[PDB]
Amino acid sequence: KYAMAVAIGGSLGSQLSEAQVSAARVVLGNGVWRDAVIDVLRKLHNVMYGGKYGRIDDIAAMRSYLNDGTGLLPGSEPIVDVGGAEGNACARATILLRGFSSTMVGVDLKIQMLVELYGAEPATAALLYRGWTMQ
Amino acid sequence: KYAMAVAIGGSLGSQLSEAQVSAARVVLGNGVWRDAVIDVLRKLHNVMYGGKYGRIDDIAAMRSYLNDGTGLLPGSEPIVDVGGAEGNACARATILLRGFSSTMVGVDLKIQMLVELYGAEPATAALLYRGWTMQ
Amino acid sequence: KYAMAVAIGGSLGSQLSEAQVSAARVVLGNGVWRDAVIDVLRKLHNVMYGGKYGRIDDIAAMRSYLNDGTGLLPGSEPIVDVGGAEGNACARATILLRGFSSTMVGVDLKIQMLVELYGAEPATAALLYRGWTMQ
């Protein structure tokens, strides 16, 4: 949904509070995310953090960067730091879905977010870019 | 829904970003909006912009102002300017649904917004104004 | 829902506008709230306002404080003041559900809010606290 995406991606920012780090596992499932979630998260991380912390290449390298450690540029500090591993990984995954309400992420990636992260249909999410039908 | 209205009307403001201009076509349909949408949009535009840019009189003159051009006071500049026509009209339509979370728009118009713009029932949207049942 | 809770609890704050005071009766029902709503509201009021205005002890004393009057410390001014009784009581009830998006309220109470105030399942609201499944 559009409102769900907007609220989830506007509420959290720059400091994941004691109860915001799990917004990913709330929006997405809790088991293994399949491949479209991971590819969208990889594209979001690229667009939003490759200018400083280097990008990642493969969908399997996003998983290895997401859960356990890193894969960013050598010497660069973590994107986000909240606490232990089980919460730091979930925060590193959450910090990306705020890319919906960000001017850096294009409209096509916002549609891809609505399609893969949240439950929305491509034909009904297509009207995210402009167009007027004399309404 | 109340949360959908609040999030959609609080997220966007004063500068419709590259991917906010189509919030109207997202909330409303994409075809022709019928008459209740247009009347609510006309009332919102009156309340929110007639003090400066003049009001509009008829539901058919809201359509003619909405899609193609104007109809505001002679010499007054556009309410919002984002880009080409197909996106400028959708932005001029979007800039009104932020009237939910605005102190200028009364509570009766907020109920009318919930009833006509979003999908909500009048009997269940009636409890927008005060009243206490010893809960 | 998570997005509904976040939007409702982030939109309103510190000044309940002409059309925010009834967010409680919008989220909750309009009749008598049963006992879980009242206990969650009592815990929220304790955590958020007992440091200054004193806490309340019983679920039945939350009702007596909620609808008609008070029960706070002797000499302490009201938590929130909007207008007449029918709206002041609803504002005093609304000012608590903003505790979701507050660093003072713990994560267990956020889960309890999602479970009792809004419609969410305990097993599906349990993933509000950290944990990573190698997604």
Residue numbers in the entry:
A (entry chain E), B (entry chain C), C (entry chain D): 1292 to 1426
Provide the authors' own sentences about this structure as they appear in the paper.
Rosellinia necatrix megabirnavirus 1-W779 (RnMBV1) is a non-enveloped icosahedral double-stranded (ds)RNA virus that infects the ascomycete fungus Rosellinia necatrix, a causative agent that induces a lethal plant disease white root rot. RnMBV1 is a potential viro-control approach agent for restraining and controlling the white root rot disease, because the virus can confer hypovirulence to its host fungus. RnMBV1 is an approximately 52 nm bipartite dsRNA mycovirus composed of dsRNA-1 (8.9 kbp in length, AB512282) and dsRNA-2 (7.2 kbp in length, AB512283). The RnMBV1 capsid is composed of 120 chemically identical MCP subunits and additional surface CrPs.
In addition, the 3D reconstruction of the CrPs was obtained by symmetry expansion with 244,609 particle orientations and imposed with C1 symmetry, which generated the final map at 3.3 Å resolution. Small-surface trimeric CrPs are present on the RnMBV1 MCPs at the 3-fold axes. The CrP is composed of C-terminal 135 residues (Lys1292–Gln1426) of the ORF3 in the genome segment dsRNA-2. In addition, each CrP displays α-helix-rich structures, which are formed of seven α-helices (HA–HG). The total interface area between each CrP trimer and three MCP_B subunits at the 3-fold axis is 2.6 x 103 Å2. The interactions are intervened by the hydrophobic interaction of the MCP_B loop Pro548-Lys555 and the CrPs and by one hydrogen bond between MCP_B Arg533 and CrP Gly1341. The CrPs are not present at all 3-fold axes. After 3D focused classification, one CrP trimer was recovered with highest intensity and was deemed to have 100% occupancy, whereas other CrP trimers were 30% occupancy. The averaged CrP trimer numbers per particle are 6.7 for full particles and 8.0 for empty particles, respectively. These results probably reflect their limited and weak interactions with MCPs.
